[PDB]
């Protein structure tokens with residue numbers, strides 16, 4: 333059971349929020365590419 | 372809200388249909404400064420402060 337969130341202490345000025353569908357021996361291989369091009 | 376404590380709603384990441392507001396008969400003042408109502412339905416903006 334997930335009952336511990338300790339990643340931040342505050343959130344002051346939000347510009348953008350987006351809630352989406354979930355993306356997700358070792359059995360799974362997850363490849364991701366993150367790019368910042370022209371904003 | 373009261374004018375001293377005016378509510379501010381930030382509007383982002385959606386489709387803004389301004390013709391529903393402009394063609395309503397329920398508004399007495401619809402004075403736009405810096406832009407015309409006819410091209411509001413064409414232009415695109417980063418954020419809307421209400």
Ligand SMILES: *[C@@H]1O[C@H](CO)[C@@H](O)[C@H](O)[C@H]1NC(C)=O
Nearest residue numbers: 342343344345346347379381
């Ligand atoms: C960002 O937040 C601080 C305090 O939370 C505030 O003083 C400042 O005006 C805010 N700036 C914008 C652009 O919202």
